[PDB]
Structure formats: structure tokens, C-alpha cells
């Protein structure tokens, strides 16, 4: 049990073994803007989601998720430009008698499709796929989902590991950019193997996202 800390936040990880760095590049500051690594770099734990049998998937955009989230959300409104890597812990705590799997896919430029800002930007609650709501096995764009495993990703197979970790570097055409407008990353959690459980066990296991913005740096503060 590894107990991680970032300032006024603390997390209880099993242990950081099955941790995927996206594209083998650790988040780095730009090799010019300010770096509020003081307290904006902490664990923001979103509101948990319930994975029932019927669930098709969930998705969040980054940093649109962390838009109402305290200092990062503040920084990201009162500055004009910013860039941030992330550490997404997807913990999915279930008993030994639940079974299933989750594909956790970090997606660069995750343009979804069933269009408008409020619609493409659900914030902290996230959105959900469906068989608007994009198609689950497409991620909106008419994709075959198996191919999705090109994306930086990790499986949460309940028999084995019950949590994934994705370390995302800043991916963008530009060196820095407006965060209020343009979501670099996109997280989609789809249940590969559906949930099932023993007769009168907990019929909906929870899933929790913990997002530490790594190496964030912003410019210019209004």
C-alpha cells in the first residue's frame, strides 16, 4: 500500500507497478511562462461513477474536467495560455466475486461525435457512450474498438489488478495553448468484458478518477 501525497491531498494506491506512461514521454516543463507548481499540482478526485451491467462507457476531456477544480481551474481561466501533463489514477474497487474488465484509453485530440461546446465539454461529471451520446465501440468516430488499443491505455481486469494509472505528457501541435478552448487529452473508459457478480453481491461497483496535473505552467495572468 503506497500512500501518495501532493500538498493538501493524499491517495491510497495499491502500488504503482502497472503504470502506463503515454508515448514513453514523461511530462516536462517547456525547455516565458510561469510554473504554478505550488498547489495547483495536487490530486483532484472526481465524482465516482457506478458501473452497472448495462454500462457502455464513460469519458472525460482534459483539462475540461479540471475546470471547476480549485487552483488549476482558476489558473486555467485567468491565464490565457497553459500546458499540463497529468497522472490519471483510475481506481475501481470491487470484491473478489465481481468480474469484468475496463479499457482505459487516453486519447489525443479526442474529438467525439454522435459538436457544440457545452455538449463536447461535460466538465467533472463526464459523458457516457451508448450502444447526445457517442457510439461506444466507435468513440463517436467510426472506429472499430479493438483498434483503440493503439492509444495510450491500460486494462483494469477485475480478477487481476483493480486500478490503472496513466501518465500523460502534454500532446499538442503547439508548445503552449489556451486551455479554456482546446482539450488536448481525452479519457475514455469502456467495459471490455461486462460486469457480472455473484448472486446478491454489490450490483454496481464504483470507479474513481484521480487527476494530478503534472508540470503545469501558464501565461499570462489577467
Amino acid at each position: 500500500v503506497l500512500q501518495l501525497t501532493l500538498g493538501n491531498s493524499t491517495i491510497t494506491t495499491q502500488e504503482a507497478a502497472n503504470s502506463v506512461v503515454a508515448y514513453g514521454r514523461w511530462p516536462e516543463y517547456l525547455r516565458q511562462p510561469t510554473e504554478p507548481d505550488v498547489a495547483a499540482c495536487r490530486f483532484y478526485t472526481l465524482d465516482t461513477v457506478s458501473w452497472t451491467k448495462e454500462s457502455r462507457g464513460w469519458w472525460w476531456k482534459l483539462p475540461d474536467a479540471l475546470r471547476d477544480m480549485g487552483l488549476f481551474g482558476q489558473n486555467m481561466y485567468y491565464h490565457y495560455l497553459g500546458r499540463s501533463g497529468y497522472t490519471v489514477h483510475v481506481q475501481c474497487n470491487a470484491s473478489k466475486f465481481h468480474q469484468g474488465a475496463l479499457g482505459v484509453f487516453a486519447v489525443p485530440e479526442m474529438c467525439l461525435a454522435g459538436t457544440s461546446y457545452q455538449n463536447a465539454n461535460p466538465g467533472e461529471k463526464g459523458g457516457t457512450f451508448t450502444g447526445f451520446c457517442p457510439v461506444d465501440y466507435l468513440l463517436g468516430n467510426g472506429t472499430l474498438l479493438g483498434n483503440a488499443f493503439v492509444f495510450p491505455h491500460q486494462i483494469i481486469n477485475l480478477r487481476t489488478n483493480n486500478c490503472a494509472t496513466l501518465v500523460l505528457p502534454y500532446v499538442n501541435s503547439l508548445s503552449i495553448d489556451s486551455m479554456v478552448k482546446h482539450n488536448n487529452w481525452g479519457i475514455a473508459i469502456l467495459p471490455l468484458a461486462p460486469l457480472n457478480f455473484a448472486s446478491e453481491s454489490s450490483p454496481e461497483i464504483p470507479i474513481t478518477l484521480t487527476i494530478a496535473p503534472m508540470c503545469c505552467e501558464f501565461n499570462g495572468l489577467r
Binding site: 514513453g24 465481481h98 468480474q99 465501440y137 483498434n147 483503440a148 481486469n157 468484458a193
Partner: protein
């Protein structure tokens, strides 16, 4: 001046040609590049990724989530395999749509090995044994567990290891193989049988699911591009 002699193949535009053309923006100073993470240098890097085999391509299951899961019940225990996947990676409709198959639909020839991976997505309590057989080229696939066992196989104890990798090897008369053969199934037959019916404890769902992944190995290569995308 210097006396020259215009040869044949002059004033022809060969689309394949490589020459030094005159730039229309000679003074323009290009926007420099940056170190965007995730640079690709070769298409085969995208085939060395374990994507996900769709096994059930029936009218109902196909083009949904269900087409990737192979269901393991404890129903009447027949000897015919859980699944038998032919490795005609572009010709076999199942492996045709994987990223491997996608890149192989862009090429006339290929060679090398394929690693398959089967992932058990059932209960942590479930136990049993699946036999993962590999019949080599020419061999008609096994129909019974014994036939498969006698060949190449891997007994895979669900209880102990929750995944099972198998690197099918490279075997071909030619240095490469066509992706559109003479309508002739050859090479692979990755079969999966029950060695033991799955054991579950208290009221645990006897219906599990297993997923299947596939990726080109390191040795894998393609040649002679063939674009066919059209409308």
C-alpha cells in the same frame, strides 16, 4: 555550351520520380518543429501493438461490443473448440480488421511472426484449464482436444495465470506471403479447447468471457505497398 543529348524518358512525369523541384516560397522561413510526444517512424510500429481480435462476427454481435468476447459457459461439454482462428491475417475476416490487418491491407507481401494473447476476464475465484493449440500450415485444424494436445499446445490454468501469450512462428516457402492468396487457407489455426470445465465457487456466474489480442512480432515486415481504398 556543354553539348548534351536528351535521352528517352525526358519530359515524362513519372509519379514515382524523385527530383529537386523549385520551391514557390523561397524566402519563407518555415515554422520549426517541436518534440511532440508519440512520433512514428514506421507503420510497423502500429502493427507491433496488441489490438483486439473480434471473434463473433455474427449479424447480431458484429459491430457492437459483443463481437470481441468469447463466452465460456459450463453448458454441455463438447470437444469442438471454444474458438478456432485461422491466421490468414488479411484474408481471415476476424484478423482482417485488426490494426495488423489494416496495415496488411496496404501491402502486397508480408512476413514474420504473430503474437496472440488471450485474456481471461472472469471471476478471480474461477479455476480450470484451457488448451491453446496451434496447428501449423497445411494441417487441417484439430476437431478434438486430443488431436490438438498431441500437436503444439499450451495448457493454461485460469487460476494461476490470467493471460496467455503465444508467438506463432514464421514459416513460408517464399521469403514473404501474399495478402490475397489463391483463396487458399494455410498456415495458422489457433484453437482453444477446454481441458477442464471451469470451476466456480458459491453462486459465481458460470458464464465468463475471454478476450483475444494480436500483434506483429519484431521480426515482422511488409513490402510492395498496394493502396486499394476507394469509393
Amino acid at each position: 555550351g556543354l553539348p548534351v543529348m536528351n535521352t528517352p524518358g525526358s519530359n515524362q512525369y513519372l509519379t514515382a520520380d524523385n527530383f529537386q523541384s523549385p520551391c514557390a516560397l523561397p524566402e519563407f522561413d518555415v515554422t520549426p518543429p517541436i518534440d511532440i510526444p508519440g512520433e512514428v517512424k514506421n507503420m510497423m510500429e502500429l502493427a507491433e501493438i496488441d489490438t483486439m481480435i473480434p471473434f463473433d462476427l455474427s449479424a447480431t454481435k458484429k459491430n457492437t461490443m459483443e463481437m470481441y468476447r468469447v463466452r465460456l459457459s459450463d453448458k454441455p461439454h463438447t470437444d469442438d473448440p471454444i474458438l478456432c482462428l485461422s491466421l490468414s491475417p488479411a484474408s481471415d475476416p476476424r484478423l482482417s480488421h485488426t490494426m495488423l490487418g489494416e496495415i496488411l491491407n496496404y501491402y502486397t507481401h508480408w512476413a514474420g511472426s504473430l503474437k496472440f494473447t488471450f485474456l481471461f476476464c472472469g471471476s478471480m475465484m474461477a479455476t480450470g484449464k484451457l488448451l491453446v493449440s496451434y496447428a501449423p500450415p497445411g494441417a487441417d485444424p484439430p476437431k478434438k482436444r486430443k488431436e490438438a494436445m498431441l500437436g503444439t499446445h499450451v495448457i493454461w490454468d485460469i487460476g494461476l495465470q490470467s493471460s496467455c501469450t503465444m508467438v506463432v512462428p514464421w514459416i513460408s516457402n517464399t521469403t514473404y506471403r501474399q495478402t490475397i492468396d489463391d483463396s487458399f487457407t494455410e498456415g495458422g489455426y489457433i484453437s482453444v479447447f477446454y481441458q477442464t470445465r471451469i470451476v466456480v465457487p458459491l453462486s459465481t456466474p458460470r458464464e465468463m468471457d475471454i478476450l483475444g489480442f494480436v500483434s506483429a512480432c519484431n521480426d515482422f515486415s511488409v513490402r510492395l505497398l498496394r493502396d486499394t481504398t476507394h469509393i
